[PDB]
Amino acid sequence: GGFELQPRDGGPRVALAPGETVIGRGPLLGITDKRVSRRHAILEVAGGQLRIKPIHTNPCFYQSSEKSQLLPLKPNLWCYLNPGDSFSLLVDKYIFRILSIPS
């Protein structure tokens, strides 16, 4: 199964290629705030699973599908993301929901 990102701000969906994808400041996600690194985190799609690893001093945030608050992620650790979960590159901004393919 594959994966795509759904911006919570109503931006168009972003498909994720198999393997690793660097996310952060850049055209892929349309992020311009300079508090987000151009190499802010890694997303890996492999064997039907998505995991995220924050790789910058400025953190990533995590919110599981059945929870209601963006929690800061442990730096440089992998976290598996299920369909319905969300992650973000700022605590209140640049939030993305995980969708599976097929859905």
Binding site: R25, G26, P27, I31, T32, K34, R35, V36, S37, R38, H56, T57, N58
Partner: peptide, 8 residues
């Protein structure tokens, strides 16, 4: 719009 060093 996407270039420039990151801020901490």
């Amino acid at each position: 719009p996407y270039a420039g060093e990151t801020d901490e």
